[PDB]
């Protein structure tokens, strides 16, 4: 499995798509000021190297597309996945807690 992942065959990409399907991943920007600076998202695989961020959440992130970078963390636990889906999702926090 390790060798065939290193070789990156097509079925490896298919299995990666299968795994990604509904596993939330949480993105955060560097100066996390309030709790809305780290939010969970459903990932969609893109053929590139830059994270594509939904514009409506940018005001929450204080993020603009002039060279900003963001970090990605995988909640690799069932409880962590539920917490990301039920507490961290962008659709969950619409009204700011201020």
Q: Where does this chain bind Mg ion (CB under 5 A)?
A: 64, 66, 68
23 touching another protein, by CB under 8 A? yes
Rounded least distance, CB 1 to another protein, Å:
9
89 touching another protein, by CB under 8 A? yes
Q: From the list Mg ion, another protein, DNA, none, which binds 64 (C-beta under 5 to 8 Å, kind-based)?
A: Mg ion
85 touching another protein, by CB under 8 A? yes
66 appears as a binding residue in the annotation: yes
Binding range to another protein, per CB under 8 A, among 9-17, 50-58, 64-72, 87-95 = 87-95
Bridging pattern class, strands 25-29 and 38-41: antiparallel
DSSP readout, the chain? -HHHHHHT-HHHHHHHHHHHTT--EEEEESS--SGGGEEEE-----SSSS----GGGHHHHT--TTT--EEEE---SHHHHHHIIIIIBTTT--S---
Binding-site residue numbers are 64, 66, 68
């Amino acid at each position: 499995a390790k060798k065939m992942v290193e070789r990156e065959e097509a079925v490896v990409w298919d299995i990666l798509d299968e795994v990604i399907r509904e596993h939330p991943v949480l993105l955060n920007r560097a100066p996390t000021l309030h709790r809305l600076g780290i939010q969970a998202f459903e990932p969609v695989l893109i053929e590139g190297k830059a994270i594509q961020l939904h514009p409506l959440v940018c005001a929450a992130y204080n993020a603009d597309f002039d060279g900003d970078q963001m970090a990605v963390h995988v909640p690799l636990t069932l409880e962590a996945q539920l917490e990301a889906r039920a507490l961290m999702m962008s659709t969950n926090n619409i009204l700011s807690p201020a």
